[PDB]
CSV table of C-alpha atoms in Angstrom, one decimal:
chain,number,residue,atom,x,y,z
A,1,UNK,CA,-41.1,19.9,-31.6
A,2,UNK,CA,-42.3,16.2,-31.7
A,3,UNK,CA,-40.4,13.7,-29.9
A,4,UNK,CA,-40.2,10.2,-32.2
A,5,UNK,CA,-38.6,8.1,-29.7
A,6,UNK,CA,-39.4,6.8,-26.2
A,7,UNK,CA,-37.6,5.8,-23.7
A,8,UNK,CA,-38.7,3.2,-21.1
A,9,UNK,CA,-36.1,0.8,-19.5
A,10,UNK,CA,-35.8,-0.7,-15.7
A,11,UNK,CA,-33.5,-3.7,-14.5
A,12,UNK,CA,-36.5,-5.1,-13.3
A,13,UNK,CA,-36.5,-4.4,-9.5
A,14,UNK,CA,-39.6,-2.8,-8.2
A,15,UNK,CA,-42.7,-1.2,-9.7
A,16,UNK,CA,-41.5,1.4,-12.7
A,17,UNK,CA,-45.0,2.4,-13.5
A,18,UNK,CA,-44.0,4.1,-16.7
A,19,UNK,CA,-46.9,5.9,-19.2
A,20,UNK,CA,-46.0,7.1,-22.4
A,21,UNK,CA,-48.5,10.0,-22.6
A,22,UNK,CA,-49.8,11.8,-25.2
A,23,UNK,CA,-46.9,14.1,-27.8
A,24,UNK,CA,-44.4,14.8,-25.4
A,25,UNK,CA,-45.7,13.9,-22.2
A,26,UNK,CA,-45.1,11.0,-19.8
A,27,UNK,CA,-45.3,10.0,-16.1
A,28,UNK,CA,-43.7,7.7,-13.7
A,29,UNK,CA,-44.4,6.2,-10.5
A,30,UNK,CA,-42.0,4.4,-8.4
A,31,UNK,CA,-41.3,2.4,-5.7
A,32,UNK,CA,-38.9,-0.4,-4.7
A,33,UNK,CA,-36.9,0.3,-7.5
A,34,UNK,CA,-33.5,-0.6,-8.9
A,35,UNK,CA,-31.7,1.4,-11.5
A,36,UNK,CA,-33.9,2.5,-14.3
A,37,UNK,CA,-34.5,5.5,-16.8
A,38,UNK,CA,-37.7,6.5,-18.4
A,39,UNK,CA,-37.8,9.4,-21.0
A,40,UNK,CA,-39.1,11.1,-24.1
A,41,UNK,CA,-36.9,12.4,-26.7
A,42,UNK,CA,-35.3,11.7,-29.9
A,43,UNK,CA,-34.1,8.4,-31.6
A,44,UNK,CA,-30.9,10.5,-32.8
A,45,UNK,CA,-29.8,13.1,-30.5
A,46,UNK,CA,-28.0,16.2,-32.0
A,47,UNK,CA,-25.7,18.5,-30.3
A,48,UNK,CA,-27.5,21.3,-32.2
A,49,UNK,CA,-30.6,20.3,-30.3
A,50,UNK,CA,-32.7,22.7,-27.9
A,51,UNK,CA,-34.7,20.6,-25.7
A,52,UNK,CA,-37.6,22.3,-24.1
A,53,UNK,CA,-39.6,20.6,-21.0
A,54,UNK,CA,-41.9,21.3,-18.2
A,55,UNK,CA,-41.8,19.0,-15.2
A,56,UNK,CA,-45.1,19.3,-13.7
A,57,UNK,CA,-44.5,16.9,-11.1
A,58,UNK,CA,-40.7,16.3,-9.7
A,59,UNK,CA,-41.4,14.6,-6.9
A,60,UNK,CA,-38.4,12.2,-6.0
A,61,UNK,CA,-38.8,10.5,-2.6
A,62,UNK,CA,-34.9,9.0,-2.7
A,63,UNK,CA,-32.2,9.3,-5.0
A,64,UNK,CA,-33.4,9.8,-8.9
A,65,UNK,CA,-32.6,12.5,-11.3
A,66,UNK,CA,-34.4,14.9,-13.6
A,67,UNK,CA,-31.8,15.3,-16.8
A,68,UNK,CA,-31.3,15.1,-20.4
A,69,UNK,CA,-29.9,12.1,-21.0
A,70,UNK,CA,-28.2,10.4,-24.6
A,71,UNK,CA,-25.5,8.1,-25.6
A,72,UNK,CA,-22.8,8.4,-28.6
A,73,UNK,CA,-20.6,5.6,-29.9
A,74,UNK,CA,-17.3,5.6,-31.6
A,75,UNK,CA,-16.3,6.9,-28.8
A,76,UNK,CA,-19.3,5.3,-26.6
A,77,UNK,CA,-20.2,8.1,-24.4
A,78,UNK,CA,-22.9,8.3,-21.9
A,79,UNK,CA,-23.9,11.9,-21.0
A,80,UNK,CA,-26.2,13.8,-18.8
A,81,UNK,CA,-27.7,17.6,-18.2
A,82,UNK,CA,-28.9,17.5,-14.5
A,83,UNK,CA,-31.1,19.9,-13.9
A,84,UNK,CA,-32.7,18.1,-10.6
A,85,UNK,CA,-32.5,15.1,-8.3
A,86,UNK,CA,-34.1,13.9,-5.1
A,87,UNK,CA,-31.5,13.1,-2.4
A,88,UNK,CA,-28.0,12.8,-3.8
A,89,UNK,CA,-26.9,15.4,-5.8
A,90,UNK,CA,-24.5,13.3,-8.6
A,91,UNK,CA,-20.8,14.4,-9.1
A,92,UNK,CA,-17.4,13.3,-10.7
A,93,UNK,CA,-14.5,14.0,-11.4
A,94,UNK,CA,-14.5,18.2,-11.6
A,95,UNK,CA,-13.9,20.2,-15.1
A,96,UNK,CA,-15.3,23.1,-14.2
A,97,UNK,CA,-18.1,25.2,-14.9
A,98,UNK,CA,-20.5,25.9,-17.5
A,99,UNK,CA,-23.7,29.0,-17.8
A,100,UNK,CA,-26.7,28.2,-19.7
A,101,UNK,CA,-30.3,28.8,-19.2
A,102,UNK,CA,-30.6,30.4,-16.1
A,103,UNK,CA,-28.1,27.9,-14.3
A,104,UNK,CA,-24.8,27.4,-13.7
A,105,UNK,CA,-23.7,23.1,-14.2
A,106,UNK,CA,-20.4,22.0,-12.6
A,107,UNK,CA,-18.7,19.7,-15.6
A,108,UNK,CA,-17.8,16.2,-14.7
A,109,UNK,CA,-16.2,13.2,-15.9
A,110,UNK,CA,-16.7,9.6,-14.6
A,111,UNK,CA,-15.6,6.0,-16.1
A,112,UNK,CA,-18.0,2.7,-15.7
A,113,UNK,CA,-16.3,-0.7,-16.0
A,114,UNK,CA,-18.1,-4.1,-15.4
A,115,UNK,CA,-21.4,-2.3,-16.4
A,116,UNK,CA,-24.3,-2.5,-18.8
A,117,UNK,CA,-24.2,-0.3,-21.8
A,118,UNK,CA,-26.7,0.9,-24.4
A,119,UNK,CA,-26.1,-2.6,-26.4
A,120,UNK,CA,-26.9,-4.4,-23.6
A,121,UNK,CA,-23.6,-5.9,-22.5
A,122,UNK,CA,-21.1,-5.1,-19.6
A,123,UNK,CA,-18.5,-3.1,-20.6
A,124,UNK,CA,-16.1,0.0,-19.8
A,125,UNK,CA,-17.4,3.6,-21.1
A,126,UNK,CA,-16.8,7.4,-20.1
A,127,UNK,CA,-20.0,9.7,-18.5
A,128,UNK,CA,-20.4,13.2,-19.2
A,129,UNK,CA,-21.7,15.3,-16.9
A,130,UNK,CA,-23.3,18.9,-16.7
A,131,UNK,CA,-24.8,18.9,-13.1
A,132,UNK,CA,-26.8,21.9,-12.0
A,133,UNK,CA,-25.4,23.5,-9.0
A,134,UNK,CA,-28.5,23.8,-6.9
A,135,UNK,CA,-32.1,22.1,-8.1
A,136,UNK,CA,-33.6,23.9,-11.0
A,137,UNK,CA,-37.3,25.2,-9.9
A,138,UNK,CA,-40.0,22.9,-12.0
A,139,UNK,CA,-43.5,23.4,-13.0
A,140,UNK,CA,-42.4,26.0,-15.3
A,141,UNK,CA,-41.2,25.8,-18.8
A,142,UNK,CA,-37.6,25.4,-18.9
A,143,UNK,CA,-34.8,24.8,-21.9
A,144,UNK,CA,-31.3,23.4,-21.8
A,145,UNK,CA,-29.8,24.8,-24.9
A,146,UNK,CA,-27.9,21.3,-25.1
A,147,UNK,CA,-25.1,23.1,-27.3
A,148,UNK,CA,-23.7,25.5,-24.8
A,149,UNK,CA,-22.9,21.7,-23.3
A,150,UNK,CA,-21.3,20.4,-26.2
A,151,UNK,CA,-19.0,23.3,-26.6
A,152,UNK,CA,-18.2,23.9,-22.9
A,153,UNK,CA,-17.6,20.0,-22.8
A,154,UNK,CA,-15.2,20.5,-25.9
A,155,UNK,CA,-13.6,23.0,-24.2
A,156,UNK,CA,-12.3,20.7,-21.5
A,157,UNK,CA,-11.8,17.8,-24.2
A,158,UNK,CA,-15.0,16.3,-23.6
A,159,UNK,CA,-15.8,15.4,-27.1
A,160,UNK,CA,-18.7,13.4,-28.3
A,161,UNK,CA,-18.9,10.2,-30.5
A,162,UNK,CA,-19.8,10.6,-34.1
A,163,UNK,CA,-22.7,8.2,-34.2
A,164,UNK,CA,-25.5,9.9,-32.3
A,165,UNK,CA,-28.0,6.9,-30.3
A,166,UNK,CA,-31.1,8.1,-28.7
A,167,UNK,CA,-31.6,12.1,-26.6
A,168,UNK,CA,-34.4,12.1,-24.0
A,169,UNK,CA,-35.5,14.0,-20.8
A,170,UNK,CA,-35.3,11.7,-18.5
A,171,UNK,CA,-36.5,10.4,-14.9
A,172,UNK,CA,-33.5,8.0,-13.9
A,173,UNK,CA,-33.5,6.2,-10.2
A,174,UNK,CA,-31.7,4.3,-8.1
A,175,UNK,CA,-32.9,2.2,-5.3
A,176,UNK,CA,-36.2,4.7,-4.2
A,177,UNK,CA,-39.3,5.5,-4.9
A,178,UNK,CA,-41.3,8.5,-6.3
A,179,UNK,CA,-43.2,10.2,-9.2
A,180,UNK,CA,-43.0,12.7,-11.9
A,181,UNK,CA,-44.6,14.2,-14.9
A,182,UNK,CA,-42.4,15.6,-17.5
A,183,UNK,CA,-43.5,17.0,-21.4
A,184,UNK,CA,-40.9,17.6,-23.6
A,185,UNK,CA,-40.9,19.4,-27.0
């Protein structure tokens, strides 16, 4: 599938060397970062939607994470499929589990307060989370059949917004420095 949308944003700290590639592809290289989050995706996600990727290069130095990454609003909701991560493996507060693709996620919830949403404002807002429970091998195709998310997350009463804002597969950092190249379809 073509991805129409992408994603490139940094708080400014650091070199975020971001290269929106041809189709689906893109690369990062980082160093000295802050928080940012580069991706390619879809300006609308869906909960219907299979994302396929390959991640030829996951090579995380520090803390950063390989996921599919979206908002909703009305509720705003931030969400995240983790399928890899450099040093710290993120968590929340435990839901329980979920099987898809291969992998088995632990469900999470978080809250954010005092911090900057998708309209570009500090704010209060409520994370989703599907973290996989070890790092999920790269360099080979892999899918996240984001669905079997949405329904596991449902089943916990983890319910999405109705307006759907952007759904990418994303390299998101904090405070390190690394690379990786990542094509999604």
């Amino acid at each position: 599938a073509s991805t129409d949308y992408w994603h490139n944003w940094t708080d400014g700290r650091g070199i975020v060397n971001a290269v929106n590639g041809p189709g689906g592809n893109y690369s990062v290289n980082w160093s000295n970062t802050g928080n940012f989050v580069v991706g390619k995706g879809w300006t609308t996600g869906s909960p219907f939607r299979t994302i396929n990727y390959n991640a030829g290069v996951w090579a995380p130095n520090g803390n950063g994470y390989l996921t599919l990454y979206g908002w909703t609003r009305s509720p705003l909701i931030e969400y995240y499929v983790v399928d890899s991560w450099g040093t710290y493996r993120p968590t929340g507060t435990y839901k329980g589990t979920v099987k898809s693709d291969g992998g088995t996620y632990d469900i999470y919830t978080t809250t954010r307060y005092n911090a900057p949403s998708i309209d570009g404002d500090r704010t209060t807002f409520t994370q989703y989370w599907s973290v996989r429970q070890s790092k999920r091998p790269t360099g080979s195709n892999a899918t996240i059949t984001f669905s079997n998310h949405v329904n596991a997350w449902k089943s916990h009463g983890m319910n999405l917004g109705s307006n759907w804002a952007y759904q990418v597969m994303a390299t998101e950092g904090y405070q390190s420095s690394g690379c990786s190249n990542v094509t999604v379809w």
